Design a protein around this ligand. Sequence first.
Ligand SMILES: NS(=O)(=O)c1ccc(NC(=O)Nc2cnn(-c3ccc(S(N)(=O)=O)cc3)c2-c2ccccc2)cc1
Ligand SMILES: [Zn+2]
Length: 259
Amino acid sequence: SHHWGYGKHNGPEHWHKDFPIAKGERQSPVDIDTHTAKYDPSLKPLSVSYDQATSLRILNNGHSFQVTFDDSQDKAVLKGGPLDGTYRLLQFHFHWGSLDGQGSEHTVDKKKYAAELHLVHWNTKYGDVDKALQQPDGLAVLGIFLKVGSAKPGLQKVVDVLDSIKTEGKSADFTNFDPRGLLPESLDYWTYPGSLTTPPLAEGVTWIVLKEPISVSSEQVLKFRKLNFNGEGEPEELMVDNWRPAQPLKNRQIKASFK
Ligand SMILES: NS(=O)(=O)c1ccc(NC(=O)Nc2cnn(-c3ccc(S(N)(=O)=O)cc3)c2-c2ccccc2)cc1
Ligand SMILES: [Zn+2]
C-alpha cells in the first residue's frame, strides 16, 4: 500500500510532489513515433532466454498484479540488443484500461493498446535489484502490447488465479509458469533510455518495446478489470486504468531493431 495511485487525487499528475524526478529528463512511458525512430544496424541480436525460468508467487500489490521469479541465479535472462551484459528476470506485471481502447503506457504513433505487459529485469553486474535501481543502466524492461482479439493460451493460467488475489496484499503460489507463452512471434523492437513508470520513477531503465502485440480475448482482459486497488473490506474501487500517460521525450532518440 502507498499514498500514490491512479485516481484524481493521487494519480500521475500528483506524483512529482513526492517524487520530483517525475519531471526528469528520461521519464517513461513515451509515445513511439515510428517515423522518427532510427533503424540502428549496430544493435546486436536480442536474446530472450527463459527456458529455465522459475516462477514463485502471484501478488496483488495495490497498483498491478505481478508474477515473481527466482532471480538468485541466471535462470531467465535477457541479453543482446542494446544491452551490455546479462539481465535477470525478477517479475512481470501488467497495465490495462477500463475500455479496450486504452490501457497501455507506451503508445505507437499515439495509438493506445488495451494493455501492456512489462517483464522486469536487472543488470547482474550490480549484484542485487536494490543496487541496480540506483544505476543508469540498472534495469531492462521488455514491454509487450496487448490487443483484444483471439485468446492467448499462455495467459490463461494467470487469468484463472486472479479471483484468488482480488485485493491488495493477497498472494498465491504460482509455480511452473512459463513466460515464453506470453511472447509474440517476432522480437523486432524499439529501444530508448527511460525510467520506471511507477514511483520511485527511477531513471535506470533500458526500455525494449516489441513491435508485434499479442492478442488476448475480451474474456481475458475482463478478468483483469475485476481486480481491486483496495485491500479487503475497504470501499470497492476497480483496478482499471493503472497506466501512466506518455511523458516528454526531451533529448532522447528511439532506435529500431528493424527497417
Ligand atoms: N525474486 S523475488 O525475491 O521473489 C522478488 C521479486 C520481486 C520483488 N519486488 C518487486 O517486484 N517490486 C516492485 C513492484 N512493482 N515494481 C515495478 C514497478 C513498475 C515497473 S515498470 N512499469 O516496468 O516501469 C517495474 C517494476 C517493482 C520493482 C522491481 C524491481 C525494481 C523496481 C521496482 C521482490 C522480490
Ligand atoms: Zn510496468
